[PDB]
């Protein structure tokens, strides 16, 4: 369910927009808003492509425990705007197309290394 949590946090297949509002919305939509996940990147494109980050197919092992996708993934990094951890969770969306560091557990994305989307 971390995969689910991952999808929920980091997967937005076909994001419409990927602007702030998208972040704010997807962040809300994803329960990522209490508190506002200070930064929450939603990988777009096929789930499979992200899923694949977990295989040394679309995944390079990365840092410790992490996998950095080989493929780049249209990824919208909702950076919480405002210090406030709390709703309204205003998000700078940062539509970023860049492989995604994830932490694949059992071939399942279980983690998006958000660090890579802090700037």
What technique solved it?
Answer: X-ray
Residues carrying an active site annotation? 10, 111
> What is the C-alpha separation between 82 and 88, in angstroms, rounded?
10
Residues belonging to the binding site for tRNA are: 18-19, 78, 100
β partners of residue 35: none
Instruction: For residue 98, count other CB atoms closer than 10 A to its CB.
Output: 17
- Give residue 63's domain range: 1-119
8 phi and psi, to 5 degrees?
-60, -40
Which residue from 77, 21, 69, 20 is spatially nearest to 46, judged by alpha carbons? Answer: 69
Q: Looking at the DSSP assignment, which residues form a beta bridge with residue 43?
A: 11, 75
Contact yes or no for 73/38 (Cβ under 8 A): no
Based on DSSP, count helices (H) and strands (E) in the chain, helices before strands: 3, 8
DSSP-assigned states of every residue in 45-62: S-HHHHHGGGTTTTEEEE
**What 3-state class would DSSP assign to 84?**
coil
Give yes or no for a contact between 50 and 108, defined as CB atoms under 8 angstroms apart.
no
Bond prior to 35 in cis (omega within 30° of 0): yes
C-beta separation of 90 from 80 below 8 A: yes
The reported resolution of this PDB entry, expressed in Å, is 2.1
Q: What is the CATH classification number for the domain harbouring 94?
A: 3.10.130.10
Q: Domains in the chain: how many in total?
A: 1
Reply yes or no: is the peptide bond before residue 4 cis, omega within 30 of 0: no
Binding-site annotation, residues = 18-19, 78, 100
Which H or E run contains 22?
helix 20-29
Q: Are 109 and 51 in contact (CB under 8 A)?
A: yes
């Amino acid at each position: 369910s971390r995969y689910t949590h991952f999808l929920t946090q980091h997967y937005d297949a076909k994001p419409q927009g990927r602007d702030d509002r998208y972040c704010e919305s997807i962040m809300r939509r994803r329960g990522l808003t209490s508190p506002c996940k200070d930064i929450n990147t939603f990988i777009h494109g096929n789930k499979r492509s992200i899923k694949a980050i977990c295989e040394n197919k679309n995944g390079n092992p990365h840092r410790e425990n992490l996998r950095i996708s080989k493929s780049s993934f249209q990824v919208t990094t909702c950076k919480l705007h405002g210090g406030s951890p709390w709703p309204p969770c205003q998000y700078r969306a940062t539509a970023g197309f860049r492989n995604v560091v994830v932490a694949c557990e059992n071939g399942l994305l279980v983690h998006l290394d958000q660090s890579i989307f802090r700037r």
